[PDB]
Amino acid sequence: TNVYADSFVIRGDEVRQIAPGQTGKIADYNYKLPDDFTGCVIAWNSNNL
Amino acid sequence: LSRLDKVEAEVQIDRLITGRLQSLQTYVTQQLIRAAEIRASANLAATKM
């Protein structure tokens, strides 16, 4: 019906924090996936930029 | 709960609920059967009375 595309840049270690229902700094105080989630997490490196 | 972060507890509390909820339905289904046993006995008492 209606999608929300939201993006940001985080570290190569903390990305495992990004998972629906985990802890760690990015999911604790920065950006919070909900308790019941549907979408996809798309993650890649942009080290050359 | 206080041992784990809740997204794990949601999993565990199942095995609690799934356990306890069952243990009720065992106990309840017992009572129904046992109730009828008294039920027939009560009918016999009314018949004798």
PDB file of N, CA and C in Angstrom:
ATOM      1  N   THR A   1       0.823  -1.200   0.000  1.00  0.00           N
ATOM      2  CA  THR A   1       0.000   0.000   0.000  1.00  0.00           C
ATOM      3  C   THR A   1       0.860   1.254   0.000  1.00  0.00           C
ATOM      4  N   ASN A   2       1.835   1.316   0.902  1.00  0.00           N
ATOM      5  CA  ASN A   2       2.601   2.529   1.143  1.00  0.00           C
ATOM      6  C   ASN A   2       3.929   2.199   1.805  1.00  0.00           C
ATOM      7  N   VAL A   3       5.022   2.455   1.102  1.00  0.00           N
ATOM      8  CA  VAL A   3       6.304   2.005   1.616  1.00  0.00           C
ATOM      9  C   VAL A   3       7.054   3.204   2.169  1.00  0.00           C
ATOM     10  N   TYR A   4       7.921   2.923   3.126  1.00  0.00           N
ATOM     11  CA  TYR A   4       8.777   3.930   3.728  1.00  0.00           C
ATOM     12  C   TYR A   4      10.213   3.544   3.430  1.00  0.00           C
ATOM     13  N   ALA A   5      10.880   4.357   2.626  1.00  0.00           N
ATOM     14  CA  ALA A   5      12.272   4.116   2.287  1.00  0.00           C
ATOM     15  C   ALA A   5      13.142   5.082   3.075  1.00  0.00           C
ATOM     16  N   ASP A   6      13.800   4.594   4.122  1.00  0.00           N
ATOM     17  CA  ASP A   6      14.639   5.475   4.918  1.00  0.00           C
ATOM     18  C   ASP A   6      16.059   4.940   4.978  1.00  0.00           C
ATOM     19  N   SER A   7      17.028   5.834   4.802  1.00  0.00           N
ATOM     20  CA  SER A   7      18.406   5.400   4.639  1.00  0.00           C
ATOM     21  C   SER A   7      19.332   6.220   5.517  1.00  0.00           C
ATOM     22  N   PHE A   8      20.485   5.632   5.814  1.00  0.00           N
ATOM     23  CA  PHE A   8      21.520   6.265   6.621  1.00  0.00           C
ATOM     24  C   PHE A   8      22.826   5.515   6.408  1.00  0.00           C
ATOM     25  N   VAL A   9      23.874   5.972   7.088  1.00  0.00           N
ATOM     26  CA  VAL A   9      25.220   5.425   6.964  1.00  0.00           C
ATOM     27  C   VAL A   9      25.735   5.068   8.346  1.00  0.00           C
ATOM     28  N   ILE A  10      26.127   3.812   8.537  1.00  0.00           N
ATOM     29  CA  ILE A  10      26.638   3.335   9.814  1.00  0.00           C
ATOM     30  C   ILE A  10      27.932   2.569   9.567  1.00  0.00           C
ATOM     31  N   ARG A  11      28.497   2.034  10.643  1.00  0.00           N
ATOM     32  CA  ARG A  11      29.793   1.380  10.583  1.00  0.00           C
ATOM     33  C   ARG A  11      29.660  -0.076  10.171  1.00  0.00           C
ATOM     34  N   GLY A  12      30.776  -0.642   9.714  1.00  0.00           N
ATOM     35  CA  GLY A  12      30.763  -2.011   9.233  1.00  0.00           C
ATOM     36  C   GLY A  12      30.674  -3.040  10.336  1.00  0.00           C
ATOM     37  N   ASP A  13      30.883  -2.623  11.582  1.00  0.00           N
ATOM     38  CA  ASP A  13      30.751  -3.540  12.705  1.00  0.00           C
ATOM     39  C   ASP A  13      29.346  -3.491  13.295  1.00  0.00           C
ATOM     40  N   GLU A  14      28.749  -2.303  13.348  1.00  0.00           N
ATOM     41  CA  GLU A  14      27.498  -2.128  14.072  1.00  0.00           C
ATOM     42  C   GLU A  14      26.275  -2.545  13.268  1.00  0.00           C
ATOM     43  N   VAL A  15      26.454  -3.020  12.033  1.00  0.00           N
ATOM     44  CA  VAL A  15      25.313  -3.259  11.155  1.00  0.00           C
ATOM     45  C   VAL A  15      24.520  -4.474  11.612  1.00  0.00           C
ATOM     46  N   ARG A  16      25.153  -5.364  12.378  1.00  0.00           N
ATOM     47  CA  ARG A  16      24.431  -6.494  12.946  1.00  0.00           C
ATOM     48  C   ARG A  16      23.496  -6.033  14.058  1.00  0.00           C
ATOM     49  N   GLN A  17      23.761  -4.857  14.635  1.00  0.00           N
ATOM     50  CA  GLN A  17      22.775  -4.210  15.492  1.00  0.00           C
ATOM     51  C   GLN A  17      21.498  -3.919  14.724  1.00  0.00           C
ATOM     52  N   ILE A  18      21.628  -3.512  13.460  1.00  0.00           N
ATOM     53  CA  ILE A  18      20.449  -3.335  12.627  1.00  0.00           C
ATOM     54  C   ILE A  18      19.882  -4.706  12.313  1.00  0.00           C
ATOM     55  N   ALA A  19      18.809  -5.043  13.002  1.00  0.00           N
ATOM     56  CA  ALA A  19      18.015  -6.251  12.910  1.00  0.00           C
ATOM     57  C   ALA A  19      16.789  -5.962  13.750  1.00  0.00           C
ATOM     58  N   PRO A  20      15.603  -6.373  13.321  1.00  0.00           N
ATOM     59  CA  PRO A  20      14.389  -6.035  14.073  1.00  0.00           C
ATOM     60  C   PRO A  20      14.327  -6.760  15.409  1.00  0.00           C
ATOM     61  N   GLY A  21      14.508  -5.996  16.480  1.00  0.00           N
ATOM     62  CA  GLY A  21      14.529  -6.554  17.813  1.00  0.00           C
ATOM     63  C   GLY A  21      15.903  -6.992  18.276  1.00  0.00           C
ATOM     64  N   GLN A  22      16.869  -6.081  18.245  1.00  0.00           N
ATOM     65  CA  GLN A  22      18.179  -6.305  18.842  1.00  0.00           C
ATOM     66  C   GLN A  22      18.566  -5.089  19.668  1.00  0.00           C
ATOM     67  N   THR A  23      19.760  -5.140  20.246  1.00  0.00           N
ATOM     68  CA  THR A  23      20.286  -4.048  21.046  1.00  0.00           C
ATOM     69  C   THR A  23      21.590  -3.572  20.431  1.00  0.00           C
ATOM     70  N   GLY A  24      22.256  -2.675  21.138  1.00  0.00           N
ATOM     71  CA  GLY A  24      23.403  -1.976  20.607  1.00  0.00           C
ATOM     72  C   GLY A  24      23.025  -0.592  20.102  1.00  0.00           C
ATOM     73  N   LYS A  25      24.057   0.258  19.987  1.00  0.00           N
ATOM     74  CA  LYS A  25      23.906   1.714  20.067  1.00  0.00           C
ATOM     75  C   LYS A  25      22.986   2.271  18.993  1.00  0.00           C
ATOM     76  N   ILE A  26      23.150   1.785  17.760  1.00  0.00           N
ATOM     77  CA  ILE A  26      22.359   2.272  16.637  1.00  0.00           C
ATOM     78  C   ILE A  26      20.897   1.897  16.819  1.00  0.00           C
ATOM     79  N   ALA A  27      20.644   0.698  17.326  1.00  0.00           N
ATOM     80  CA  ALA A  27      19.271   0.348  17.628  1.00  0.00           C
ATOM     81  C   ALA A  27      18.856   0.769  19.024  1.00  0.00           C
ATOM     82  N   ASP A  28      19.742   1.384  19.798  1.00  0.00           N
ATOM     83  CA  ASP A  28      19.327   1.768  21.137  1.00  0.00           C
ATOM     84  C   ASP A  28      18.924   3.231  21.194  1.00  0.00           C
ATOM     85  N   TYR A  29      19.694   4.095  20.545  1.00  0.00           N
ATOM     86  CA  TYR A  29      19.463   5.519  20.680  1.00  0.00           C
ATOM     87  C   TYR A  29      19.384   6.244  19.348  1.00  0.00           C
ATOM     88  N   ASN A  30      19.647   5.562  18.239  1.00  0.00           N
ATOM     89  CA  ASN A  30      19.826   6.214  16.950  1.00  0.00           C
ATOM     90  C   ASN A  30      18.663   5.926  16.008  1.00  0.00           C
ATOM     91  N   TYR A  31      18.345   4.665  15.770  1.00  0.00           N
ATOM     92  CA  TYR A  31      17.318   4.285  14.813  1.00  0.00           C
ATOM     93  C   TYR A  31      16.738   2.946  15.228  1.00  0.00           C
ATOM     94  N   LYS A  32      15.418   2.864  15.351  1.00  0.00           N
ATOM     95  CA  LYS A  32      14.821   1.707  15.999  1.00  0.00           C
ATOM     96  C   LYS A  32      13.859   0.993  15.069  1.00  0.00           C
ATOM     97  N   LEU A  33      14.233  -0.217  14.665  1.00  0.00           N
ATOM     98  CA  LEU A  33      13.302  -1.132  14.034  1.00  0.00           C
ATOM     99  C   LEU A  33      12.247  -1.577  15.044  1.00  0.00           C
ATOM    100  N   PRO A  34      11.012  -1.805  14.602  1.00  0.00           N
ATOM    101  CA  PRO A  34       9.936  -2.088  15.558  1.00  0.00           C
ATOM    102  C   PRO A  34       9.982  -3.500  16.109  1.00  0.00           C
ATOM    103  N   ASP A  35       8.967  -3.866  16.890  1.00  0.00           N
ATOM    104  CA  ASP A  35       8.887  -5.227  17.400  1.00  0.00           C
ATOM    105  C   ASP A  35       8.336  -6.188  16.357  1.00  0.00           C
ATOM    106  N   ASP A  36       7.459  -5.709  15.482  1.00  0.00           N
ATOM    107  CA  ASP A  36       6.918  -6.508  14.393  1.00  0.00           C
ATOM    108  C   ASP A  36       7.181  -5.757  13.099  1.00  0.00           C
ATOM    109  N   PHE A  37       8.015  -6.332  12.241  1.00  0.00           N
ATOM    110  CA  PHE A  37       8.584  -5.619  11.107  1.00  0.00           C
ATOM    111  C   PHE A  37       8.395  -6.453   9.854  1.00  0.00           C
ATOM    112  N   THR A  38       8.332  -5.790   8.703  1.00  0.00           N
ATOM    113  CA  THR A  38       8.084  -6.467   7.443  1.00  0.00           C
ATOM    114  C   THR A  38       9.240  -6.335   6.462  1.00  0.00           C
ATOM    115  N   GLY A  39       9.893  -5.178   6.427  1.00  0.00           N
ATOM    116  CA  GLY A  39      10.709  -4.781   5.302  1.00  0.00           C
ATOM    117  C   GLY A  39      12.053  -5.470   5.210  1.00  0.00           C
ATOM    118  N   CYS A  40      12.848  -4.988   4.265  1.00  0.00           N
ATOM    119  CA  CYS A  40      14.166  -5.523   3.982  1.00  0.00           C
ATOM    120  C   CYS A  40      15.232  -4.547   4.444  1.00  0.00           C
ATOM    121  N   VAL A  41      16.327  -5.095   4.946  1.00  0.00           N
ATOM    122  CA  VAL A  41      17.507  -4.317   5.281  1.00  0.00           C
ATOM    123  C   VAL A  41      18.492  -4.517   4.149  1.00  0.00           C
ATOM    124  N   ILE A  42      18.819  -3.447   3.480  1.00  0.00           N
ATOM    125  CA  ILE A  42      19.775  -3.493   2.392  1.00  0.00           C
ATOM    126  C   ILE A  42      21.024  -2.758   2.826  1.00  0.00           C
ATOM    127  N   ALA A  43      22.158  -3.431   2.723  1.00  0.00           N
ATOM    128  CA  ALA A  43      23.390  -2.937   3.302  1.00  0.00           C
ATOM    129  C   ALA A  43      24.552  -3.230   2.373  1.00  0.00           C
ATOM    130  N   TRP A  44      25.353  -2.208   2.093  1.00  0.00           N
ATOM    131  CA  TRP A  44      26.579  -2.416   1.343  1.00  0.00           C
ATOM    132  C   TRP A  44      27.615  -1.409   1.799  1.00  0.00           C
ATOM    133  N   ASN A  45      28.833  -1.625   1.328  1.00  0.00           N
ATOM    134  CA  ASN A  45      29.951  -0.749   1.607  1.00  0.00           C
ATOM    135  C   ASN A  45      30.027   0.356   0.571  1.00  0.00           C
ATOM    136  N   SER A  46      30.334   1.551   1.047  1.00  0.00           N
ATOM    137  CA  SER A  46      30.684   2.665   0.194  1.00  0.00           C
ATOM    138  C   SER A  46      32.029   3.245   0.577  1.00  0.00           C
ATOM    139  N   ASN A  47      33.045   2.391   0.742  1.00  0.00           N
ATOM    140  CA  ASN A  47      34.341   2.831   1.250  1.00  0.00           C
ATOM    141  C   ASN A  47      35.056   3.741   0.263  1.00  0.00           C
ATOM    142  N   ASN A  48      34.824   3.546  -1.035  1.00  0.00           N
ATOM    143  CA  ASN A  48      35.481   4.360  -2.045  1.00  0.00           C
ATOM    144  C   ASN A  48      34.912   5.769  -2.146  1.00  0.00           C
ATOM    145  N   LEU A  49      33.809   6.062  -1.464  1.00  0.00           N
ATOM    146  CA  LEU A  49      33.194   7.379  -1.515  1.00  0.00           C
ATOM    147  C   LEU A  49      33.282   8.104  -0.181  1.00  0.00           C
TER     148      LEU A  49
ATOM    149  N   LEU B   1      12.539 -12.582  31.847  1.00  0.00           N
ATOM    150  CA  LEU B   1      12.619 -11.227  31.326  1.00  0.00           C
ATOM    151  C   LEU B   1      13.937 -10.572  31.704  1.00  0.00           C
ATOM    152  N   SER B   2      14.114 -10.272  32.989  1.00  0.00           N
ATOM    153  CA  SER B   2      15.264  -9.487  33.414  1.00  0.00           C
ATOM    154  C   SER B   2      16.588 -10.146  33.073  1.00  0.00           C
ATOM    155  N   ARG B   3      16.589 -11.417  32.694  1.00  0.00           N
ATOM    156  CA  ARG B   3      17.819 -12.033  32.222  1.00  0.00           C
ATOM    157  C   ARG B   3      18.123 -11.686  30.773  1.00  0.00           C
ATOM    158  N   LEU B   4      17.101 -11.524  29.936  1.00  0.00           N
ATOM    159  CA  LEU B   4      17.294 -11.453  28.497  1.00  0.00           C
ATOM    160  C   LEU B   4      16.600 -10.233  27.913  1.00  0.00           C
ATOM    161  N   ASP B   5      17.033  -9.857  26.740  1.00  0.00           N
ATOM    162  CA  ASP B   5      16.300  -8.777  26.099  1.00  0.00           C
ATOM    163  C   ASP B   5      15.024  -9.317  25.463  1.00  0.00           C
ATOM    164  N   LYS B   6      13.929  -8.588  25.653  1.00  0.00           N
ATOM    165  CA  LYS B   6      12.585  -9.149  25.448  1.00  0.00           C
ATOM    166  C   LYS B   6      12.411  -9.878  24.124  1.00  0.00           C
ATOM    167  N   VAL B   7      12.942  -9.374  23.000  1.00  0.00           N
ATOM    168  CA  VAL B   7      12.747 -10.120  21.745  1.00  0.00           C
ATOM    169  C   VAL B   7      13.127 -11.584  21.844  1.00  0.00           C
ATOM    170  N   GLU B   8      13.986 -11.949  22.793  1.00  0.00           N
ATOM    171  CA  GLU B   8      14.177 -13.359  23.107  1.00  0.00           C
ATOM    172  C   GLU B   8      13.080 -13.878  24.027  1.00  0.00           C
ATOM    173  N   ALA B   9      12.680 -13.077  25.013  1.00  0.00           N
ATOM    174  CA  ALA B   9      11.653 -13.519  25.948  1.00  0.00           C
ATOM    175  C   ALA B   9      10.356 -13.860  25.236  1.00  0.00           C
ATOM    176  N   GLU B  10      10.021 -13.122  24.178  1.00  0.00           N
ATOM    177  CA  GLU B  10       8.841 -13.447  23.394  1.00  0.00           C
ATOM    178  C   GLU B  10       8.881 -14.895  22.941  1.00  0.00           C
ATOM    179  N   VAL B  11      10.079 -15.411  22.667  1.00  0.00           N
ATOM    180  CA  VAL B  11      10.218 -16.809  22.286  1.00  0.00           C
ATOM    181  C   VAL B  11      10.029 -17.714  23.494  1.00  0.00           C
ATOM    182  N   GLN B  12      10.746 -17.428  24.575  1.00  0.00           N
ATOM    183  CA  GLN B  12      10.680 -18.286  25.749  1.00  0.00           C
ATOM    184  C   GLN B  12       9.272 -18.318  26.321  1.00  0.00           C
ATOM    185  N   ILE B  13       8.694 -17.143  26.568  1.00  0.00           N
ATOM    186  CA  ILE B  13       7.389 -17.072  27.208  1.00  0.00           C
ATOM    187  C   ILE B  13       6.354 -17.894  26.460  1.00  0.00           C
ATOM    188  N   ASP B  14       6.561 -18.141  25.167  1.00  0.00           N
ATOM    189  CA  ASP B  14       5.775 -19.162  24.490  1.00  0.00           C
ATOM    190  C   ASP B  14       5.834 -20.471  25.253  1.00  0.00           C
ATOM    191  N   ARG B  15       7.028 -21.055  25.347  1.00  0.00           N
ATOM    192  CA  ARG B  15       7.172 -22.342  26.009  1.00  0.00           C
ATOM    193  C   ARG B  15       6.656 -22.316  27.438  1.00  0.00           C
ATOM    194  N   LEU B  16       6.593 -21.143  28.072  1.00  0.00           N
ATOM    195  CA  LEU B  16       5.827 -21.045  29.310  1.00  0.00           C
ATOM    196  C   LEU B  16       4.334 -21.093  29.027  1.00  0.00           C
ATOM    197  N   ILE B  17       3.852 -20.200  28.164  1.00  0.00           N
ATOM    198  CA  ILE B  17       2.421 -20.144  27.903  1.00  0.00           C
ATOM    199  C   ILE B  17       1.946 -21.448  27.292  1.00  0.00           C
ATOM    200  N   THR B  18       2.613 -21.883  26.225  1.00  0.00           N
ATOM    201  CA  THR B  18       2.260 -23.148  25.603  1.00  0.00           C
ATOM    202  C   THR B  18       2.208 -24.265  26.631  1.00  0.00           C
ATOM    203  N   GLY B  19       3.112 -24.237  27.599  1.00  0.00           N
ATOM    204  CA  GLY B  19       3.045 -25.194  28.678  1.00  0.00           C
ATOM    205  C   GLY B  19       1.864 -24.968  29.594  1.00  0.00           C
ATOM    206  N   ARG B  20       1.766 -23.771  30.171  1.00  0.00           N
ATOM    207  CA  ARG B  20       0.731 -23.528  31.166  1.00  0.00           C
ATOM    208  C   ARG B  20      -0.649 -23.604  30.544  1.00  0.00           C
ATOM    209  N   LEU B  21      -0.831 -22.952  29.398  1.00  0.00           N
ATOM    210  CA  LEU B  21      -2.119 -22.997  28.717  1.00  0.00           C
ATOM    211  C   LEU B  21      -2.574 -24.430  28.524  1.00  0.00           C
ATOM    212  N   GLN B  22      -1.663 -25.289  28.072  1.00  0.00           N
ATOM    213  CA  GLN B  22      -1.973 -26.707  27.995  1.00  0.00           C
ATOM    214  C   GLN B  22      -2.400 -27.239  29.350  1.00  0.00           C
ATOM    215  N   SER B  23      -1.564 -27.028  30.367  1.00  0.00           N
ATOM    216  CA  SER B  23      -1.832 -27.582  31.685  1.00  0.00           C
ATOM    217  C   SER B  23      -3.197 -27.170  32.209  1.00  0.00           C
ATOM    218  N   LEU B  24      -3.673 -25.985  31.840  1.00  0.00           N
ATOM    219  CA  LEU B  24      -5.060 -25.655  32.120  1.00  0.00           C
ATOM    220  C   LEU B  24      -5.992 -26.583  31.363  1.00  0.00           C
ATOM    221  N   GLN B  25      -5.850 -26.631  30.040  1.00  0.00           N
ATOM    222  CA  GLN B  25      -6.786 -27.415  29.246  1.00  0.00           C
ATOM    223  C   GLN B  25      -6.788 -28.867  29.671  1.00  0.00           C
ATOM    224  N   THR B  26      -5.656 -29.378  30.143  1.00  0.00           N
ATOM    225  CA  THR B  26      -5.683 -30.671  30.806  1.00  0.00           C
ATOM    226  C   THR B  26      -6.581 -30.615  32.027  1.00  0.00           C
ATOM    227  N   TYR B  27      -6.285 -29.699  32.949  1.00  0.00           N
ATOM    228  CA  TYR B  27      -7.069 -29.605  34.172  1.00  0.00           C
ATOM    229  C   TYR B  27      -8.529 -29.326  33.872  1.00  0.00           C
ATOM    230  N   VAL B  28      -8.795 -28.407  32.952  1.00  0.00           N
ATOM    231  CA  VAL B  28     -10.178 -28.071  32.651  1.00  0.00           C
ATOM    232  C   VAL B  28     -10.904 -29.284  32.097  1.00  0.00           C
ATOM    233  N   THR B  29     -10.366 -29.863  31.024  1.00  0.00           N
ATOM    234  CA  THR B  29     -10.995 -31.031  30.426  1.00  0.00           C
ATOM    235  C   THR B  29     -11.190 -32.141  31.443  1.00  0.00           C
ATOM    236  N   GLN B  30     -10.286 -32.262  32.410  1.00  0.00           N
ATOM    237  CA  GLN B  30     -10.546 -33.142  33.534  1.00  0.00           C
ATOM    238  C   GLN B  30     -11.853 -32.772  34.212  1.00  0.00           C
ATOM    239  N   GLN B  31     -11.924 -31.550  34.741  1.00  0.00           N
ATOM    240  CA  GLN B  31     -13.080 -31.134  35.521  1.00  0.00           C
ATOM    241  C   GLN B  31     -14.382 -31.429  34.790  1.00  0.00           C
ATOM    242  N   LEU B  32     -14.450 -31.079  33.507  1.00  0.00           N
ATOM    243  CA  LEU B  32     -15.648 -31.364  32.727  1.00  0.00           C
ATOM    244  C   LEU B  32     -16.019 -32.832  32.817  1.00  0.00           C
ATOM    245  N   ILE B  33     -15.055 -33.711  32.569  1.00  0.00           N
ATOM    246  CA  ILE B  33     -15.304 -35.140  32.694  1.00  0.00           C
ATOM    247  C   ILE B  33     -15.715 -35.469  34.117  1.00  0.00           C
ATOM    248  N   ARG B  34     -14.937 -34.996  35.086  1.00  0.00           N
ATOM    249  CA  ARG B  34     -15.262 -35.281  36.473  1.00  0.00           C
ATOM    250  C   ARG B  34     -16.593 -34.662  36.857  1.00  0.00           C
ATOM    251  N   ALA B  35     -16.902 -33.485  36.318  1.00  0.00           N
ATOM    252  CA  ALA B  35     -18.190 -32.867  36.608  1.00  0.00           C
ATOM    253  C   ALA B  35     -19.331 -33.776  36.188  1.00  0.00           C
ATOM    254  N   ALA B  36     -19.260 -34.312  34.973  1.00  0.00           N
ATOM    255  CA  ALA B  36     -20.307 -35.208  34.510  1.00  0.00           C
ATOM    256  C   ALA B  36     -20.415 -36.429  35.406  1.00  0.00           C
ATOM    257  N   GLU B  37     -19.281 -36.925  35.903  1.00  0.00           N
ATOM    258  CA  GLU B  37     -19.315 -38.057  36.817  1.00  0.00           C
ATOM    259  C   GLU B  37     -20.143 -37.732  38.051  1.00  0.00           C
ATOM    260  N   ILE B  38     -19.916 -36.562  38.642  1.00  0.00           N
ATOM    261  CA  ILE B  38     -20.768 -36.100  39.731  1.00  0.00           C
ATOM    262  C   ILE B  38     -22.184 -35.887  39.227  1.00  0.00           C
ATOM    263  N   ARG B  39     -22.281 -35.288  38.031  1.00  0.00           N
ATOM    264  CA  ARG B  39     -23.574 -34.992  37.349  1.00  0.00           C
ATOM    265  C   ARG B  39     -24.476 -36.234  37.355  1.00  0.00           C
ATOM    266  N   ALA B  40     -23.961 -37.369  36.874  1.00  0.00           N
ATOM    267  CA  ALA B  40     -24.737 -38.633  36.853  1.00  0.00           C
ATOM    268  C   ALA B  40     -25.073 -39.042  38.292  1.00  0.00           C
ATOM    269  N   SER B  41     -24.105 -38.895  39.207  1.00  0.00           N
ATOM    270  CA  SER B  41     -24.304 -39.242  40.638  1.00  0.00           C
ATOM    271  C   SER B  41     -25.392 -38.341  41.238  1.00  0.00           C
ATOM    272  N   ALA B  42     -25.378 -37.053  40.882  1.00  0.00           N
ATOM    273  CA  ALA B  42     -26.375 -36.065  41.360  1.00  0.00           C
ATOM    274  C   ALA B  42     -27.757 -36.477  40.841  1.00  0.00           C
ATOM    275  N   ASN B  43     -27.818 -36.922  39.582  1.00  0.00           N
ATOM    276  CA  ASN B  43     -29.098 -37.379  38.976  1.00  0.00           C
ATOM    277  C   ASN B  43     -29.594 -38.593  39.768  1.00  0.00           C
ATOM    278  N   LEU B  44     -28.681 -39.505  40.119  1.00  0.00           N
ATOM    279  CA  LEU B  44     -29.038 -40.722  40.898  1.00  0.00           C
ATOM    280  C   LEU B  44     -29.573 -40.299  42.271  1.00  0.00           C
ATOM    281  N   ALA B  45     -28.937 -39.298  42.891  1.00  0.00           N
ATOM    282  CA  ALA B  45     -29.352 -38.785  44.216  1.00  0.00           C
ATOM    283  C   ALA B  45     -30.763 -38.197  44.112  1.00  0.00           C
ATOM    284  N   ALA B  46     -31.033 -37.448  43.036  1.00  0.00           N
ATOM    285  CA  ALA B  46     -32.372 -36.850  42.819  1.00  0.00           C
ATOM    286  C   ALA B  46     -33.388 -37.984  42.658  1.00  0.00           C
ATOM    287  N   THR B  47     -32.999 -39.021  41.910  1.00  0.00           N
ATOM    288  CA  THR B  47     -33.844 -40.218  41.673  1.00  0.00           C
ATOM    289  C   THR B  47     -34.123 -40.894  43.018  1.00  0.00           C
ATOM    290  N   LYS B  48     -33.094 -41.073  43.855  1.00  0.00           N
ATOM    291  CA  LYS B  48     -33.342 -41.722  45.136  1.00  0.00           C
ATOM    292  C   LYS B  48     -34.116 -40.801  46.055  1.00  0.00           C
ATOM    293  N   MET B  49     -33.689 -39.544  46.138  1.00  0.00           N
ATOM    294  CA  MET B  49     -34.429 -38.568  46.924  1.00  0.00           C
ATOM    295  C   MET B  49     -35.887 -38.547  46.512  1.00  0.00           C
TER     296      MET B  49
END
